[PDB]
Amino acid sequence: FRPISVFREANEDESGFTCCAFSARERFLMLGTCTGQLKLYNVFSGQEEASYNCHNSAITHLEPSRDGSLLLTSATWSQPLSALWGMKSVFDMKHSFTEDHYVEFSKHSQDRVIGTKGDIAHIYDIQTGNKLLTLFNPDLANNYKRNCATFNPTDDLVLNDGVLWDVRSALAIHKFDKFNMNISGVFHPNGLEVIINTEIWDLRTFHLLHTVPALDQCRVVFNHTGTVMYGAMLQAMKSPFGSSFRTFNATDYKPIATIDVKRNIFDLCTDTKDCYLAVIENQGSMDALNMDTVCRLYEV
């Protein structure tokens, strides 16, 4: 991890970057701010190329569509809490997800959005903005405090609050038992396994395949080739994470590295070719009126 770029929010003495993702245009990073703006930076020169007022509160999350035409954003306490934005020609809101704190695109075909409202998953059509499904069963709920509903790689299944749902039938096919208070889980990009906090579960037998105590309270992200898994631990303008992330082999879940950048992390992502890792790193203290974040790009 060799840092090869670094920059802060132009003209802000308290740099307010909160989240980042690469755009479909390689040299250009998308970042959210603690005041609700979407910025586009040149990830090498640190030049601010563009700025949009998307929300009334800090952006917590953004996901561009692979084709470059759409962007999801989520916010902290503003209404709508999440939104879908067209980026062809003019930047503009297509749909708003009024009380979803988190949103994700479907994976195989990006024709759908899945949103989380506490313990409830909402699935929407991109083209209409209509809610196609509500996935919630109060008897099966685990009430995970950081629940983030997600689709599997083939879009036929949803993981919501540690419950596995068949999308076509809107049936709960399995509830994974609750073994932590916070982390709800992700699908492995291989589609054979789900990672719920420290437990790796088989998707056919629901067998426990690995116990990985190092993953406790970690938000997990794969690289685009699905060979490396990045974990950043939640800590118990307050960052969601601490000052370190860990990498694992996505195949056997062996630890590769533990990097302490010694600055609280707000977010991290990779380019689609997995050459770089962008990290939003806070300068100065937990106990500060504000944050002062920078974006650092590391060559992997």
Ligand X SMILES: COc1ccc(C2(c3nc(NCCN)c4ccc(N5CCN(C)CC5)cc4n3)CC2)cc1
**Residues interacting with ligand X, by CB under 6 A?**
18-19, 34, 58, 60-61, 76, 102, 146, 148, 183, 219, 234, 237-238, 240, 266-267
Asked if residues 215 and 221 have their Cβ atoms less than 8 Å apart, the reply is no
Q: Name the residue nearer to ligand X (CB basis): 237 or 259.
A: 237
- The residue whose two tokens read 């990073």 is 29
Smallest distance, ligand X to C-beta of residue 75, A = 9
Q: Name the residue nearer to ligand X (CB basis): 88 or 145.
A: 145
Torsion of CA 232, 8, 273, 62, to 10 degrees: 60
Q: Name the residue nearer to ligand X (CB basis): 19 or 277.
A: 19
Torsion of CA 163, 200, 111, 82, to 10 degrees: 70
Smallest distance, ligand X to C-beta of residue 168, A = 26
Counted residue by residue, the chain has a size of 300
Q: Name the residue nearer to ligand X (CB basis): 149 or 228.
A: 149
Q: Which residues contact 90 (CB under 8 A, 6 or more apart)?
A: none
Smallest distance, ligand X to C-beta of residue 217, A = 8
Smallest distance, ligand X to C-beta of residue 237, A = 4
| Residue nearest to ligand X according to CB distances in the complex | 60
Q: Name the residue nearer to ligand X (CB basis): 50 or 288.
A: 288
Q: Which amino acid is at 274?
A: D
Smallest distance, ligand X to C-beta of residue 241, A = 7
Q: Name the residue nearer to ligand X (CB basis): 90 or 236.
A: 236
Smallest distance, ligand X to C-beta of residue 90, A = 25
Q: Name the residue nearer to ligand X (CB basis): 66 or 88.
A: 66
The secondary structure of residue 88, as a DSSP letter, is S
Smallest distance, ligand X to C-beta of residue 269, A = 8
Q: Name the residue nearer to ligand X (CB basis): 199 or 267.
A: 267
The secondary structure of residue 56, as a DSSP letter, is S
The secondary structure of residue 177, as a DSSP letter, is P
Torsion of CA 245, 249, 251, 253, to 10 degrees: -60
- Report how far apart, in Å, the C-alpha atoms of 217 and of each of 54, 121, 196, 197 are: 29, 21, 10, 6
- Report how far apart, in Å, the C-alpha atoms of 289 and of each of 14, 46, 281, 284, 285 are: 10, 25, 17, 11, 9
The secondary structure of residue 108, as a DSSP letter, is S
The tokens describing 71, both together, are 């962007």
For β-strands 120-125 and 131-135, DSSP reports them as antiparallel
